[PDB]
Design a protein around this ligand. Structure first.
Ligand SMILES: N[C@@H](Cc1c[nH]c[nH+]1)C(=O)O
Ligand SMILES: N[C@@H](Cc1c[nH]c[nH+]1)C(=O)O
Ligand SMILES: CSc1ccc(N)cc1
Ligand SMILES: CSc1ccc(N)cc1
Lengths: 410, 410
């Protein structure tokens, strides 16, 4: 007997499970359309080089990589953003800006689950914080579309420029900034003795702790100035999100850095207000990535990723994922095999009119055909019997036996 | 500068291309719903064992496989059907039958393109040819939904039981039947001297050629009998497809075997009636696969695969793939940055009412905002200016400047 279980750390999606996933994706798609984002895709298999950033990131530590038979180093994408950048670079001057691109790629890791789907939304060619605002509102919009309120979740928001200044003022060559954000991001999970050790292990702390634990924007105006670009940006951000109507969804948190190397400005993180779950989504501005990839002109970018697992746990906890049973409008039941041809002509017309319809495919008695119709969640059973066919009719019966002329069925 | 090109033999899908792919997938999805099929998915990464059938298949010759870091032999699926079977086996008795499952997996190969998307439709637990009928009608339905007529394409249909008998009558142990179908399938591409050599290389021909070139069902009634199960099946098949209204789409071809090992009965192949393109889709009955995988009870199955490339070439040839430009209902234009907050409250309401809307994100003059709106295919531009806002109004303008009160916009 064969191995019925999927490969280590990956999920099967039989119809029941697939309905749950499709309910989630519908929202991701519907939200992108609402916000004017265009869909894209790229291979799940990308060159390994694409992710060699050399900043001790979890995402590049836990790459699911291998060597092709022909020698080339490739990998199953751990994230989409580098793929996006490559596409953007290839377009170059032909790419009209600003561009708003989205996708729902499966992304991978080797280690616990080894794959997840991650909704990606990104805005390209927008200098101002209006990008981050839109993005953050898109994420709130989706969560709200799934049944969640500002009582259930929020989005913590920060800027890396604050810390950039503190690092810069402290004489630290700017090349150390990315490795620092990555360690500081660990602060949540690892202890302060362990996190302090990594910053010292990178050749160096006090000012970092104090600034991470600042609880308000006023307090960072004290420390940095009321027109550090970061203060002006965050105020504009919050004012814009206020104005869009999602003020109760967003708040400031000076400890939020995110784990990725390329964020340069505003960064953000979705969370459940009960403190039970990991981050629901994560994102930020990344204005230098494309310059890093070799763009002859800097290209401002911002975006986020929004996983398919934490959100589902959350929705299951809040009882917002009722099992969605399969449905179909009509189930056509031939009285017996001599009626099959006629049953098919009826099936054809039901479908021609835009309805979803089955026909009983195997041979069985009418009552068992009816039970089957109930089991597949048919809204209506259409019995095709010889007596009624003579009258140009069939027997209809609503499941959620009046005879009906064929033309009136639809 | 980074490598902008995708990995060898795989496709990027920027927004333009993705619109074409989504137009195709919409049809695959819409057709499955019309026919009552339920969506499923499974990992693109499956155990390599799953595909070791030992019958010289192209699909298992050109497996994109590798060894995980932990030693396990895995591969990127070359086809979905084995995944489907595994899922079905795992369900066992809990799986209610008949089941009609579909998916649009990316599938892989190593060698020319190395990936394609393949719509899969399969019916489980149906003994009779009504399964093959439904499946064949689903494929015609999709092609017709894409603009194609029975003048443009057809479906060639055969049964492997015919050849099974000829092989059986000729004393050939039934274990040789699969290897034979695989060689005979090559007959299209390779010469008869080369195809004859493989059948002799498998320890053995004349009767095979003659029966492959039989041009009608009557002629196979002569050779096999008018109640070989295969004659009764094909007549039922054609009668049912006749009755559904797709008689002009289907025809008999005794040379059609298909390249896969597991087909046991009816097999079929979509084709363009101009003889320009490879097969558009392919499928058949496979009643023994699950018994092969270890099912304690035989499970009848039939299905097909329908690629994303040949169909697109065909549609491009018939001029049925006009470029689909991006669209969005509204583009909200703040007169200047002081109007941004108000512009956002308007944006919120447009979206709240189910419309797709952008807001101009960067700072620019109104005429350039208008050009942008035209470029993204906005149906309507909504200017948010201070003079009109005082009146509780905005300036609307249809692109495919009458002032309007906020409540009337939606
Ligand atoms: N790539 C980020 C999310 C993101 C998309 N765009 C910008 N950031 C992540 O995987 O968490
Ligand atoms: N797996 C077949 C198509 C198919 C699906 N179900 C049965 N046959 C192919 O790749 O051509
Ligand atoms: C849970 S599977 C997963 C895969 C890739 C990343 N970057 C994170 C998580
Ligand atoms: C054109 S890519 C492709 C991938 C897998 C199979 N079986 C066939 C084709």
């Amino acid at each position: 007997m064969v191995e019925t279980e999927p490969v280590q750390g990956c999920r099967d999606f039989p119809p029941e499970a697939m309905r749950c996933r499709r309910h989630l994706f519908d929202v991701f798609h519907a939200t992108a359309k609402t916000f004017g984002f265009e869909e894209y895709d790229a291979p799940v298999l990308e060159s390994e080089e694409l992710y060699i950033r050399k900043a001790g990131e979890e995402i590049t530590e836990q790459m699911f990589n291998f060597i092709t038979k022909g020698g080339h180093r490739v990998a199953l994408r751990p994230e989409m953003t580098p793929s996006l950048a490559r596409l953007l670079l290839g377009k170059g001057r032909s790419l009209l800006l600003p561009a708003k691109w989205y996708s729902i790629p499966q992304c991978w890791r080797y280690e616990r689950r080894r794959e997840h789907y991650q909704w990606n939304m990104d805005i390209v060619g927008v200098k101002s914080v209006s990008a981050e605002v839109e993005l953050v509102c898109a994420a709130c919009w989706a969560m709200r579309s799934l049944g969640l309120s500002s009582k259930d979740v929020g989005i913590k928001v920060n800027s890396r420029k604050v810390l950039q200044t503190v690092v810069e003022q402290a004489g630290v060559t700017s090349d150390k900034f990315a490795p620092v954000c990555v360690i500081v991001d660990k602060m949540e999970k690892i202890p302060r003795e362990e996190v302090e050790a990594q910053l010292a292990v990178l050749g160096l702390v006090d000012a970092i702790t104090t600034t991470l634990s600042l609880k308000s924007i006023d307090e960072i105006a004290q420390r940095v100035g009321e027109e550090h670009e970061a203060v002006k940006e965050l105020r504009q951000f919050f004012e814009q999100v206020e104005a869009y109507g999602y003020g109760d969804w967003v708040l400031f948190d000076a400890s939020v850095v995110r784990g990725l190397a390329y964020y340069t400005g505003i960064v953000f993180e979705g969370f459940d207000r009960e403190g039970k779950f990991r981050a629901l989504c994560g994102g930020g501005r990344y204005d230098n990535l494309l310059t890093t990839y070799g763009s002859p002109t800097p290209i401002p970018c911002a975006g986020f990723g929004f996983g398919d697992c934490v959100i589902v746990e959350l929705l299951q906890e809040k009882r917002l994922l009722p099992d969605i049973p399969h449905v179909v409008d009509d189930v056509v039941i031939p009285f017996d095999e001599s009626m099959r041809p006629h049953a098919l002509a009826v099936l054809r017309r039901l479908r021609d009119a835009g309805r979803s319809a089955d026909i009983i495919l195997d041979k069985k008695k009418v009552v068992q055909a009816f039970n089957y119709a109930d089991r597949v969640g048919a809204v209506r059973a259409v019995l095709v019997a010889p007596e009624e066919w003579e009258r140009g009719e069939v027997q209809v019966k609503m499941l959620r036996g009046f005879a009906v002329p064929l033309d009136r069925l639809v």
